[PDB]
Structure 1
Amino acid sequence: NLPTAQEVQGLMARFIELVDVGDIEAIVQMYADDATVEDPFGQPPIHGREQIAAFYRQGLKVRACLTGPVRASHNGCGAMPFRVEMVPCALDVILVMRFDEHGRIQTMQAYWSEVNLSV
């Protein structure tokens, strides 16, 4: 059901793993069929697995890793810091995710902008 704190840490860390290897399909499957995503938060929310899949396929020679432990709540929520290394540029990002009673991402917000870009 709704992921407990420990379960959030697990799903979210796994997410970074998926993004890291670039397994698009596995990514999309982690999301609820109608999940929404704002990455970067504020411009603009995409909806559903088809658009999410297009988004990730669009983004993924890319590597990502946790730069801190996953922070989790008890109401199916979580946040985590991580970094993606593309091109020789690097991007620090923090994601906030809300899971549903099925353990799948309902919403995800990515926080970052040029100020978190390096190279």
Structure 2
Amino acid sequence: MLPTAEEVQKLMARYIELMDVGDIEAIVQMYADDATVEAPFGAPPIHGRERIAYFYRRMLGEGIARATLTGPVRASHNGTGAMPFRVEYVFNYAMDVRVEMRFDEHGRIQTMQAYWS
């Protein structure tokens, strides 16, 4: 069965925590088997869990400082939710990210679109 509104926030609230600490391996396992990431939305989709790992290694790999919610987690009963948030980095940077997410019956991320500022 599809994860409830409750379970979605529990899973999506966890996303921002794994981002803030920059846990790549953990986030990659949140995603379903042949999941799609569209980040930013308008660029070619990233199919497969393998290539998603690289996207997150692009974003986090360098070393993130913070990743914090800039609005409420809008969870639906269709196993989908969106949340506007922000990421900040340490270099010798910041960006407003607004992810929408779709969960399968197994509680994993099927599709993400992310809109960057």
TM-score, length-normalised on structure 2? 0.91
1:67 aligned residue: 70
> Per-residue deviation at 1:35?
0.5
Distance 1:104 1:55, change over 3 A: same
Q: What corresponds to 2:27 in structure 1? A: 27
User: How far apart in 2 are the matches of 1:45 and 1:19?
Assistant: 20
Take 1:17 and 1:38, find their aligned partners in 2: how far apart are those partners? 21
Gaps of 5+ in 1: none
1:48-105, Cα deviation, whole Å (9 max, x unpaired)? 1100001111211312111122101110100001100126722111110000000000
**Whole-angstrom CA distance in 2 between matches of 1:100 and 1:48:** 15
Q: Could you say which residue in structure 1 is the equivalent of 2:45?
A: 45
User: In the alignment, does 2:115 pair up with 1:105?
Assistant: no
One-letter code of the match for 1:72? A
SS in 2 for 1:41: coil
> Matched residue pairs, number?
113
CA RMSD, 1 decimal: 1.3
Find the aligned partners of 1:46 and 1:15 in 2 and give their Cα distance.
Answer: 18
Match of 2:84 in 1: 81
Query: What amino acid is aligned across from residue 96 of structure 1 in structure 2?
Result: E
- The whole-number CA distance in structure 1 between the counterparts of 2:78 and 2:15 is 19
Matched, 1:11 2:11: yes
- Consecutive unaligned residues of structure 2, counting only runs of 5 or more, are none
After TM superposition, give the deviation of residue 9 of structure 1 in Å. Answer: 0.9
Indicate the residue corresponding to 2:56 in structure 1.
56
